[PDB]
Amino acid sequence: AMTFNIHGGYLEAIVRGYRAGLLTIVEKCTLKLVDEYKHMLPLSTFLEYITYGHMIDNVVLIVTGRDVQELLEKCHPLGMFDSIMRELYRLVLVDTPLAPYFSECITSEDLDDMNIEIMRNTLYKAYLEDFYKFCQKLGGATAEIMSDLLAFEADRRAVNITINSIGTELTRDDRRKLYSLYPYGHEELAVCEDIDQVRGVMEKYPPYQSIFSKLSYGESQMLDKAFYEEEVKRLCLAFEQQFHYGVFFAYMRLREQEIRNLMWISEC
Amino acid sequence: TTKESMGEVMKDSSFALIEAKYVAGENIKHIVLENVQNASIKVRSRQENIAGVKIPKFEYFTDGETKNDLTGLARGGQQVQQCRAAYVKAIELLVELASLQTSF
Amino acid sequence: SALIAMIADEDTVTGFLLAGVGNVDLRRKTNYLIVDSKTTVKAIEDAFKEFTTKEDIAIVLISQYVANMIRFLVDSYNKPIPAILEIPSKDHPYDPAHDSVLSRVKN
């Protein structure tokens, strides 16, 4: 308990103040948040993992090429850092947590990362590796939030697979082999081929019960949006942010959600 | 009459695009161009005859034959239901324009 | 036959261009980047020469003819089948104003 006052107290106070102050306009807000995060530079590993979260997607996008030069336009330092096509993939395998594992898991390069569906599969595998790495750094209450996020991503991928991607070889086995209680009981979603079946599978977790509801919204989207939208709706739990705990990831997630809401506002 | 379809379906496609952007941020674009699940665009032509004029008939992907789909984006279902749904209206408008030009 | 705009608002065109195949009018050997606003439609007219005039692309579209060179593109009346233009809405209102085909339609 005394370690917080021993070190990291000032950074924690600054992060708490910045989060409390938070609430091309979307691009400007994202740039301001990224600058605030960068200026803040134990917690170093947490910041590295938080950045690597979006850096996995940034590297996946940069893996194209095929109009690859356009990736510089979205070079947001929050996720699109320069430090984080097999020949170039081997070079990019450094300075990232999920990259060494993806080097072997996605050794087929574009063959296993086709832009239609297999690129999404490689992105999901990288996200699973990053989630495993983040969960490895256990010791705080953020483990529950990380597990919830990974479960939401896995369940959304499984729902998308059962909806229409089953014809894209995303079968029941692929619901966990390629599509990133879920780390132990994800087998219940392998047969949830229907919206009613999805609700029944969600009934296995009473907290996840009634989250799907009519499933008209949230679950209607493919990729990782089905159960991820449930996490977005329940993010009010993340809004608690009890003191003397790692809240940098929570602040980053809140800033990202605010940026997304501002983008969704657009022209009213 | 069908000119208003080019506004209605365009508005629906714009709404679907905004929803997809709110869902997954920036689309993949580039290699696959993202933004859709349907519309493997390939056009087939036919020749009808009205009053001795060889009025052409047009069919294409998502508006006839030669259509294919694979996976899609997060809102790819919504994108197909709005952005790729404008394909039928566009094909009808093109057929009407060609018929009008030939008749003129 | 093929059909693509490649002179458009990017994602708006891509939403009906290439997801299951055909590479949006065979981008491997034809077509162009669907993002407009990089320059005038003079390059879009050249692409029409390289895509629509190449006996492959049948239907084309220019968003509201904002910079589509309405007078220049109005000449596409000759050989209308390979040059079936269009004026899509969204991010630019679809109007009967001067354009490629609607200008003649206004007569």
Side-chain angles (χ1 to χ4, degrees), chain A residues 1 8-9 13 17 20-21 42 53 64-65 77 79 97 99-100 126 139-143 151 154 158 167 183 185 190 200 206-207 218 226 238 246 250, chain B residues 2 7 16 18 20 24-25 39 51-52 56 64 72 74 76-77 85-86 90 98 100, chain C residues 2 5 8 15 19-20 22 43 47 58 67 80 82-83 88 93 96-97 102:
Chain A
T64 63
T142 179
Chain B
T2 197
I18 301 299
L100 191 76
Chain C
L102 311 93

